[PDB]
Amino acid sequence: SMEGKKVPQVTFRTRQGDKWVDVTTSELFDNKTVIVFSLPGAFTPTCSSSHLPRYNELAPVFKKYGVDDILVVSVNDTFVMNAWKEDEKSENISFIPDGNGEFTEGMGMLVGKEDLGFGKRSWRYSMLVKNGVVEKMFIEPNEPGDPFKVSDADTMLKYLAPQHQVQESISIFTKPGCPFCAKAKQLLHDKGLSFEEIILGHDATIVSVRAVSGRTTVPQVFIGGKHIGGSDDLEKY
Amino acid sequence: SMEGKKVPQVTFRTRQGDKWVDVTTSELFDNKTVIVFSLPGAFTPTCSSSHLPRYNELAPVFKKYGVDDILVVSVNDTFVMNAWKEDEKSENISFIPDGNGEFTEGMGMLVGKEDLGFGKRSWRYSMLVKNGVVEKMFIEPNEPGDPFKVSDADTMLKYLAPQHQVQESISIFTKPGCPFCAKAKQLLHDKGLSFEEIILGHDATIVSVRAVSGRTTVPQVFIGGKHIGGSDDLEKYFA
Amino acid sequence: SMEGKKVPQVTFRTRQGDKWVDVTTSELFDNKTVIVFSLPGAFTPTCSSSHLPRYNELAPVFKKYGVDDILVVSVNDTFVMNAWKEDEKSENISFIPDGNGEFTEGMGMLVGKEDLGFGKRSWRYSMLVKNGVVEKMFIEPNEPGDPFKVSDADTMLKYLAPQHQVQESISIFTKPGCPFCAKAKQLLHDKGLSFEEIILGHDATIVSVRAVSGRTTVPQVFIGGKHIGGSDDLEKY
Amino acid sequence: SMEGKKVPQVTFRTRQGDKWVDVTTSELFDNKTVIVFSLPGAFTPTCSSSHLPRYNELAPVFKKYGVDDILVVSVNDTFVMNAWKEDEKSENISFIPDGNGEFTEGMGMLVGKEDLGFGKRSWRYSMLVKNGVVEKMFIEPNEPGDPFKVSDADTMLKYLAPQHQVQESISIFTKPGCPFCAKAKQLLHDKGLSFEEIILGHDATIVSVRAVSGRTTVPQVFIGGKHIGGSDDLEKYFA
16 A cells, blocks of 8 residues: 555646646645545546546635645546646646556556556545655545545545534425525525535436425425425425 | 317428428328427426426327327427427427417417517417327316416326326436446336436436435436335335 | 607516516606617527627627617517527627517517518617607618618617727637637737637638638638738737 | 558447447458548647648548548547547547557557657558558658648548649638528539538628628638639639
8 A cells, every 4th residue: 555655756747828847746745735536537427427526626625624735637648638627617626647657657556447448547546645645545446347435525525524524415406497496506505505406407307306306396405315395395494 | 179170281480400491281290190289488487397398208108109299389480499499308399380370370279468478379278180180179278277287298198098007207316337227227128117317427416316315326216206226126126 | 760750659578587577668768868679589590690799799889979778679578588688698788578569560660571480570670769769770671581781780880979980890710729819819809809709610620711811820810801810910010 | 561461450449429339440441441540649739730620621532532431540538539529520530549559559650658748659640541451651750840741631632642633722601591602602512612611600700701801791702812702703703
């Protein structure tokens, strides 16, 4: 395990506009507390699914707890990394183009993925680095497919600040416009709670709502497992 | 009534692709069994965020029973109809832009709605058309309250196939690859059950699956408001 | 002609969110200088092409010259008008839902357009209204198809403030990123000039550039007829 | 060289729709005449915002001369290849994701580019393949300056059809309906001339037509950098 060991000495050849800029491993980690999470590759489903958004979303919190930088590492080059960083809207994390797989290799995390045509790429994992020394490491289990149950941002947060209480998961079925929907949305914002809004537009239809909740209309809200109800039930509880 | 009578001969000016395409009345109805339901207008409070949806939802069933096409008719033009069809996203039904009110008029269903600023529009009604001949017609009553007490898709289905008993609502959260999801989904296939699918790639993410099912993985299956579980769980239910 | 005549007395049934709001003809025009332009209908090509954008773009200027409000009138209802107003991004103009064609009829501008399936709609025209009295009117000629050579915002501006000198038309071929392209773009902004950027992305390819300019690359800039050149030619002139 | 030799047997893992699709080497080359050109990588400065474009531009011509398919090969995966294909928008060419460098390696064209952080990538080259057998190959020289002095589409065309003389560049501004535009366009059709089209509906507006041609209406036709005019004008030119 790399825990307790010094992060590999790597110099990344990056691009910032039309100019090349070498970002060194020391520059990134020395005298700093950094969170890192590697992905198999740029422009993909489970990686852009939540692994990435979720980290950008909790970045302000990690900062509040001492984390200086939160990096995303992928065995891709800058051109591709940038083009992806631009597609994703994540202004809270730095993209590291480990295109030669050097850093990933040094982390003993380089794996072959020829069955997808990705050549050698990084295995999914996250870690906390204090002054270049790997403190904690969350290596996704060796299971087939695309495992994601340990490198997530939450697991990291609970590890970094277990005191911070785990906020309940919040999903909300809403119809565009729909008066009382906005009455639950902003009520959440006002309550300062994050949530996933499944819109009856392109995400789901009315079936799901009726199949999941039973009720025949929106807005439907479920908070961490338990079923809430209408904008008027949200209020109550 | 128009029951037993031939549907009006109308040529609709529509917009297919970035070009104009004339869709004739004969083309739509000749030698075909069609379901039709008119609406006062596009984007107006559909008055039932379920009316148009429910038809699109039961379309597969109507097809199973002989209906060739299910059309939505509104006294609007194609530009507006298309922009709306792109909203409602109801892939199972054709949108007919009776923008001159010609077809609606011929059906003796043209009514004035100047009190809403809609000019002349269609009155709410549905009908079954066999080879151009209006077979059945469900003309909405002039009663306050639910605007669709008779032209709804259900009333139509019960009429066309009273034998039929709609399956309970089925929703399943899935992900790409996930063979478990496939095992769960095949099970449904091999059960004559329909099922909406919320893909973790786009339709949603992990947050939603945790929130709704209180579980940490997919597939998560819901049937009729009750939570069932995953591939494994379904099989127990279907035993 | 309606010039010198009082605008029709109409009350429009509009929608603002989930509530109905009557907007009266007097409310709009009384004691006010208003610019108006009617369209055959909402959600269409030549109407959303430039007729509408161009008016929203020059609105600040019309205001600077005394125009209080700039209205878009179409024989459509509010639901459709709003849904369109939301699609178009024009925060400088008011949308008037003349769904009964009443106002349009009063303006003697109601025409039949059954050949498109639009039923009765408005004929394209713009006008300047001072305290409810039509001052000037630019009625598009009676030609087949969809005529647009008189109701435009420019014709209006030149009429309202002929002193204001006509700014030259500016189109620019650019490649995404393309260093020197941004060197012409913002140079224009800095120069305070409006322009149409044809991007080699989805608008055009390299052929057009080579067919129009001749030069083999971007950024290509043409200002009112005459061919400019490279970001470095723009500078010179 | 690989000239006269059979192309490597490779199965490419690609992404068609939201599903995986194996595209085999045989499927691409067997019983077909194919043009291929490899690139160091996707999104990298294509080094010639014309290289990839020019192939897509001359594709119709290559088809006219027997070429069935024109492929772009890069040591990238489909996710990246697709996201790039969606950028470049080159409808006339197939994108091959040689993400394991397998095909490139087999062509003895795999080179290291660690100095850019690209790991192993393909070296610039194009080739003509007849029924799996490499017929001709244009391997780029190790000279500074223009990165494509031999693998370009033109060099290929002149080789495949030296008889051919590419038509001058033709661009025309048009609008929907505008019969004049159609008259101008038909004229080109009836002339074996290709022409890009900037539609006033999307590709652009009136501003651009004024700016570029100093005219107030469409159609405005440009041929080889010279301004020609409209339907009327073209006819004079084609007399």
